Ligand binder design. Structure first.
Ligand SMILES: CC(C)CCC[C@@H](C)CCC[C@@H](C)CCC[C@@H](C)CCOC[C@@H](CO)OCC[C@H](C)CCC[C@H](C)CCC[C@H](C)CCCC(C)C
Ligand SMILES: CC(C)CCC[C@@H](C)CCC[C@@H](C)CCC[C@@H](C)CCOC[C@@H](CO)OCC[C@H](C)CCC[C@H](C)CCC[C@H](C)CCCC(C)C
Ligand SMILES: CC(C)CCC[C@@H](C)CCC[C@@H](C)CCC[C@@H](C)CCOC[C@@H](CO)OCC[C@H](C)CCC[C@H](C)CCC[C@H](C)CCCC(C)C
Ligand SMILES: CC(C)CCC[C@@H](C)CCC[C@@H](C)CCC[C@@H](C)CCOC[C@@H](CO)OCC[C@H](C)CCC[C@H](C)CCC[C@H](C)CCCC(C)C
Ligand SMILES: CC(C)CCC[C@@H](C)CCC[C@@H](C)CCC[C@@H](C)CCOC[C@@H](CO)OCC[C@H](C)CCC[C@H](C)CCC[C@H](C)CCCC(C)C
Ligand SMILES: CC(C)CCC[C@@H](C)CCC[C@@H](C)CCC[C@@H](C)CCOC[C@@H](CO)OCC[C@H](C)CCC[C@H](C)CCC[C@H](C)CCCC(C)C
Ligand SMILES: *C/C=C(C)/C=C/C=C(C)/C=C/C1=C(C)CCCC1(C)C
Ligand SMILES: *C/C=C(C)/C=C/C=C(C)/C=C/C1=C(C)CCCC1(C)C
Ligand SMILES: *C/C=C(C)/C=C/C=C(C)/C=C/C1=C(C)CCCC1(C)C
Ligand SMILES: CCCCCCCCCCCCCCC
Ligand SMILES: CCCCCCCCCCCCCCC
Ligand SMILES: CCCCCCCCCCCCCCC
Ligand SMILES: CCCCCCCCCCCCCCC
Ligand SMILES: CCCCCCCCCCCCCCC
Ligand SMILES: CCCCCCCCCCCCCCC
Ligand SMILES: CCCCCCCCCCCCCC
Ligand SMILES: CCCCCCCCCCCCCC
Ligand SMILES: CCCCCCCCCCCCC
Ligand SMILES: CCCCCCCCCCCCC
Ligand SMILES: CCCCCCCCCCCCC
Ligand SMILES: CCCCCCCCCCC
Ligand SMILES: CCCCCCCCCCC
Ligand SMILES: CCCCCCCCCCC
Ligand SMILES: CCCCCCCCCC
Ligand SMILES: CCCCCCCCCC
Ligand SMILES: CCCCCCCCCC
Ligand SMILES: CCCCCCCCC
Ligand SMILES: CCCCCCCCC
Ligand SMILES: CCCCCCCCC
Ligand SMILES: CCCCCCCC
Ligand SMILES: CCCCCCCC
Ligand SMILES: CCCCCCCC
Ligand SMILES: CCCCCCCC
Ligand SMILES: CCCCCCCC
Ligand SMILES: CCCCCCCC
Ligand SMILES: CCCCCCCC
Lengths: 231, 231, 231
């Protein structure tokens, strides 16, 4: 484990995702509202999945070597197995908050799968220049997601209860800022141009992951928007 | 790329799926009917997924070598990753058109997963004679799907609006004819008996894919069956 | 095939899953109740999936070698591909029986995916002591599932029709007893401590699989709880 300088950030990430999972699990014990139960189930699964994948990276299972640039490059593939399941769950939290229609939910989840799937292909591609073709396709899929979150959901939240509109607006802004950083870290990190070393890259993804999952969840599950209007 | 004679058909397929995706995306911009939005989302995702997998084959990522018959045989595995997601989406288009019940939808999607999954196992199997055992199981799963589309959905469409009944009947006939060709191309192509060479096999799958996805989508999204009855 | 002593139990399992699939398929022909159709579709898919994965193990495709303990250990990975899809389908049978809320269904299916996913990682892990870390995480996920089936569903079934309450109680008890045996067989078998040899381990999993899928299905599909109350 300790033979890799980035191990400290993988261990911290593992701990923070595990602690986040347990807090949400305990906090959700005393909840019977069927609407609130939906948000607790979605939001608790997110850091639980991330916990297992951070642990796999810490123990060395989620790491492979990819030859490109005449070098064997360490690629943590477990990140994409994490994101494949956690990013659509996070979008479902937002879509259920605004009572989005089914067709829009399917478009979001499908574009998200394309985003993560093409990012994985780009991470494992051995022809250096082709890695950035996949990065560009994946980034186009992300821009579609961000467009929908702004010019489809925002207008839908305003016609909703005030507390669900204000909570959505906050979580929307958090998501757009944090998610946009991921393609940048990829491009300048060891998967892309190799400007930033792997140990610093790992620290950046850990800060982003914890903020986008645990921080996101703390804002959502403390809001009254997750409960139905009741007397 | 150009070192493979089949590259021209992979490049054409990539272009036609990309163009198809963009047309459906633009055409769906001016749509607010929640029913129509469902069909546009399903139908636009189909060629978008196929685009990415054709590109992976063009660039050489979606290709592996499988030893059988005393030879290293080029097997494009990316086809099955495509079909795993696009064939159930196409069946969902048909099932939603006739307002099929949930139990029937699950049976269709499950049989479809078995069809594609066993076809993938057959494509990667190293014992030559066993490849055709998997082909037979996969073909049995397809025949179940075709039976349901005829002796379960057809009777359901007649009790529906006339425009949804006539549109379903057309898309049903297109699907049964085109899908039935796939097991035949597999059997006589490089995955099976090896009668037809890979470059011709690739041309045939490209014609079938574009027809079953883009051609299918053009018929559906030009129909009024996708809109609810409104004044 | 016959070069492996466990082949006899893989062949028996294949036959019993295939026969089970055909019986459920025939029995479900004469069913039009939309509620009953749901249970028949879920319950017939379970042994059909298991059939294909037992066949892959029989023919040698679903087997790999994992080095640990200074030895190349035969690991049947196809079991986890089976369980990944069949265990959530079995939980869906139970959840639909008691009309569970959506949030609870998602929590069950998500915990089940974590259970199977971490068990697969543990089966393929090359550092011997780490294999049991994954076993423990997977077992914690199972205990969560069992808790929900007892202290969330049981109370919900009592407020239901008497026949659905008594049928659920029976299937609940069958599930908790049979599922609990799996982590024990893993721990003492070739994936874990290696006390029980592989051929005996394979026999035990076959008895458990057939009972948990075909036996489970025979109890459910003979009950009147799967039909709506009708005159
Ligand atoms: C009902 O809706 C509320 C349940 O949602 C919340 C239910 C959760 C979604 C269930 C998923 C958690 C499982 C219990 C998994 C247990 C293993 C975890 C990875 C444990 C990690 C923390 C600890 C080991 C440090
Ligand atoms: C509606 C939305 C959900 C739609 C989703 C969008 C999606 C279509 C976007 C594209 C996804 C696609 C790129 C997934 C590729 C997975 C692949 C990286 C797995 C590893 O295989 C890659 C190479 C080794 O580098 O295999 C070496 C050769 C091996 C012999 C490969 C044989 C196994 C194949 C991988 C079998 C295909 C399985 C499916 C891809 C499983 C789904 C994986 C997940 C990442 C989507
Ligand atoms: C709301 O419902 C309508 C949206 O459906 C339609 C929405 C679509 C389903 C969203 C999926 C498309 C994404 C925007 C993916 C973008 C990358 C594409 C693969 C681009 C391919 C064409 C071009 C690069 C040649
Ligand atoms: C309700 C419906 C959706 C049900 C679906 C029906 C489905 C059950 C039908 C059978 C599907 C099954 C054959 C999928 C097999 C995937 C497999 C080809 C992936 C590549 O692995 C094959 C060998 C190399 O040749 O791995 C070499 C050895 C490696 C060490 C393998 C270890 C990884 C395992 C593959 C882990 C299992 C992952 C799941 C199979 C992922 C789903 C893939 C998709 C193709 C279903
Ligand atoms: C409508 O709801 C009822 C259909 O459910 C029941 C429908 C089933 C869920 C459909 C799935 C079965 C498919 C027909 C697959 C056929 C291949 C099987 C694996 C055959 C195995 C048995 C035989 C080959 C020994
Ligand atoms: C809501 C719920 C459904 C959530 C589900 C819970 C889930 C997150 C729990 C953890 C699942 C995770 C451990 C799955 C790992 C699959 C992995 C074993 C496949 C084989 O790859 C392992 C190594 C060889 O030993 O690959 C060698 C290196 C290769 C180069 C690997 C590159 C391919 C990657 C495997 C791509 C990721 C694909 C996804 C993991 C596909 C889903 C598989 C299924 C088992 C979940
Ligand atoms: C909890 C994890 C989250 C919210 C991860 C989000 C990840 C992304 C938005 C990743 C995007 C990428 C691109 C847009 C292209 C480059 C490759 C990716 C996958 C890093
Ligand atoms: C857009 C792609 C489509 C509609 C693909 C359809 C593919 C099939 C219907 C494939 C069927 C197969 C068999 C029936 C057995 C032989 C292997 C397959 C997977 C080619
Ligand atoms: C039809 C198959 C069924 C119902 C299989 C159930 C399997 C389990 C409940 C497996 C549980 C495991 C653990 C709890 C940890 C050890 C590894 C597993 C996956 C065997
Ligand atoms: C979206 C965030 C990207 C900003 C990356 C900042 C990295 C600064 C760290 C110093 C770079 C290390 C280079 C010298 C080793
Ligand atoms: C009462 C609110 C705080 C509860 C404690 C939460 C502990 C989980 C770890 C959170 C750290 C990361 C927060 C986002 C920066
Ligand atoms: C379902 C369509 C299958 C028909 C295949 C027709 C192939 C004819 C092309 C000529 C065969 C090439 C053999 C000589 C190289
Ligand atoms: C107005 C209808 C035609 C629009 C142009 C569609 C261009 C997408 C490519 C379609 C070619 C394949 C059609 C099926 C044979
Ligand atoms: C949950 C069931 C686990 C019980 C396992 C009993 C196995 C007894 C078979 C004899 C053990 C073989 C050891 C000598 C070869
Ligand atoms: C009339 C009920 C029996 C029908 C025959 C079922 C045959 C399928 C194989 C069942 C054997 C396994 C039963 C569970 C132990
Ligand atoms: C490729 C993996 C995608 C599945 C991720 C799991 C979450 C799915 C959310 C589905 C939302 C409901 C759509 C109607
Ligand atoms: C990782 C694979 C999980 C999917 C298994 C297929 C069954 C899914 C059941 C979904 C139940 C409905 C949830 C609302
Ligand atoms: C185009 C939709 C408007 C909202 C999206 C904001 C774009 C942020 C740019 C992200 C940069 C990634 C490289
Ligand atoms: C048996 C259901 C009737 C409709 C299915 C038509 C069968 C077409 C044969 C396909 C040939 C594939 C080898
Ligand atoms: C803790 C929830 C109560 C019901 C679960 C029964 C636990 C059975 C123990 C299984 C042993 C697996 C190692
Ligand atoms: C080795 C660098 C080659 C540059 C390729 C950049 C491709 C980016 C595509 C974005 C449209
Ligand atoms: C090398 C050819 C061996 C023939 C096997 C055919 C199997 C087909 C099974 C269809 C029932
Ligand atoms: C080689 C045996 C090492 C023992 C590790 C046991 C780990 C079990 C963790 C359960 C909390
Ligand atoms: C609940 C605390 C979980 C912390 C265990 C993971 C941290 C790795 C320490 C080496
Ligand atoms: C929108 C046009 C997309 C065409 C790019 C793919 C074709 C491959 C050319 C080499
Ligand atoms: C319907 C009977 C299915 C039996 C075939 C599988 C058994 C393997 C025999 C070698
Ligand atoms: C993106 C930063 C999240 C901050 C988490 C703190 C929330 C406390 C309510
Ligand atoms: C299967 C052939 C499809 C033909 C596509 C043309 C549709 C234009 C309306
Ligand atoms: C767990 C044992 C199941 C027994 C199956 C027999 C059911 C006949 C109704
Ligand atoms: C990490 C355990 C949390 C302790 C309870 C927090 C207040 C519900
Ligand atoms: C109005 C809410 C602002 C939230 C933005 C937070 C950016 C990290
Ligand atoms: C909408 C604000 C985008 C912020 C992008 C930050 C990328 C590091
Ligand atoms: C009555 C519609 C006929 C459609 C059949 C088209 C076959 C390619
Ligand atoms: C229902 C007509 C079937 C046509 C099969 C064509 C196979 C090449
Ligand atoms: C009251 C029903 C008892 C069922 C338990 C069966 C254990 C195999
Ligand atoms: C609730 C009874 C548990 C039985 C466990 C059996 C494990 C072999």
């Amino acid at each position: 484990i300790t033979g890799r300088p980035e191990w400290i950030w993988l261990a911290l990430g593992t701990a923070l995702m595990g602690l986040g999972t347990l807090y949400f699990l305990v906090k959700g014990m005393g909840v019977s509202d069927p609407d609130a139960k939906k948000f607790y189930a979605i939001t608790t699964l997110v850091p639980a999945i991330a916990f297992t994948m951070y642990l796999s990276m810490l123990l060395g299972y989620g790491l492979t070597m990819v030859p490109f640039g005449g070098e064997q490059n360490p690629i943590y593939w477990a990140r994409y197995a994490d994101w494949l399941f956690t990013t659509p769950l996070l979008l479902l939290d937002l879509a259920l908050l605004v009572d989005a229609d089914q067709g829009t939910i399917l478009a979001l989840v499908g574009a998200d799968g394309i985003m993560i799937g093409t990012g994985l292909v780009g991470a494992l591609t051995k022809v250096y220049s082709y890695r950035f073709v996949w990065w560009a396709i994946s980034t186009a899929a992300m821009l579609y997601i961000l467009y929908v979150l702004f010019f489809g959901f925002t207008s839908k939240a305003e016609s909703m209860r005030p507390e669900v509109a204000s909570t959505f607006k906050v979580l929307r802004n958090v998501t757009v800022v944090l998610w946009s950083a991921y393609p940048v870290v990829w491009l300048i990190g060891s998967e892309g141009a190799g400007i930033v070393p792997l140990n610093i890259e790992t620290l950046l993804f850990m800060v982003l992951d914890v903020s986008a999952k645990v921080g996101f969840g703390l804002i959502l599950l403390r809001s009254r928007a997750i409960f139905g209007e009741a007397e």
